[PDB]
């Protein structure tokens with residue numbers, strides 16, 4: 374459940390008059406999301422755009438616990454939470470607006486299968502350096518979460534956002550199971566598992582740790598270098614469970630250099646203790662991302 378799992382009060386408040394709903398961005402089972410104009414929120418701006426999550430009994434208690442946890446979780450690679458609006462209904466969670474939407478959508482639209490300007494990025498597919506800076510920012514957010522001993526449980530590019538200047542942050546508005554339903558395997562009733570992103574211990578033993586998140590980051594790295602393609606896309610849900618439990622590893626993407634694939638393989642160690650830490654996976658990717666173009670052009674053959 375993301376934030377709910379970590380839970381199981383200096384929360385900032387915003388007045389309803391200060392939030393002006395413009396239009397809907399999306400809608401799901403737990404509520405909807407709107408683009409809104411927010412007044413007197415941040416100085417030297419006066420007015421600014423935000424993404425507003427509108428709460429669709431215990432929901433109100435869950436909301437406050439979610440808000441308190443979101444007020445703690447503040448980092449440069451975690452979508453910014455501004456506060457809540459509790460005067461009247463619907464209850465609202467206010468976040469920064471990320472112009473390019475979710476990371477999956479952004480990757481697919483800058484991939485070889487895209488339909489067809491470029492303010493933040495060049496024409497045609499994202500270069501090696503562009504793919505690496507994306508990876509590094511996600512890794513950095515996971516470093517902060519592991520640092521606060523937070524277990525994400527649903528790390529995937531659909532659960533990352535992209536803003537102006539290609540800034541990548543971990544975050545979502547709780548609509549992934551509705552917008553990307555084929556990225557989940559429905560067990561029974563409401564329970565939906567992101568099995569393609571899960572390690573063997575989470576599928577087999579139903580264990581979720583800091584180490585199962587590292588495996589998911591490994592899969593997120595694969596999605597980055599495959600321009601948002603679904604992992605094990607050629608397989609059904611039961612076929613994918615079989616491959617994961619039998620120790621099978623996703624193939625090296627075409628755009629992926631062997632050095633990047635070594636980071637992936639290290640995230641995909643069957644033994645959770647054997648998995649390379651996220652503090653090291655980030656340190657490894659950052660170094661690669663800011664490395665000179667002479668060194669980088671050599672990496673990509």
Ligand SMILES: Cc1ncc(NC(=O)Nc2cccc3ccccc23)c(-c2ccccc2)n1
Pocket residue numbers: 374375376377403426439446451452466525543544545546547548
């Ligand atoms: C039902 C549902 N499913 C999934 C949801 N995603 C998360 O809770 N995930 C997240 C993990 C870790 C850091 C986060 C930081 C920002 C935003 C989401 C974060 C939500 C949710 C509920 C309230 C605010 C937003 C998202 N609600």
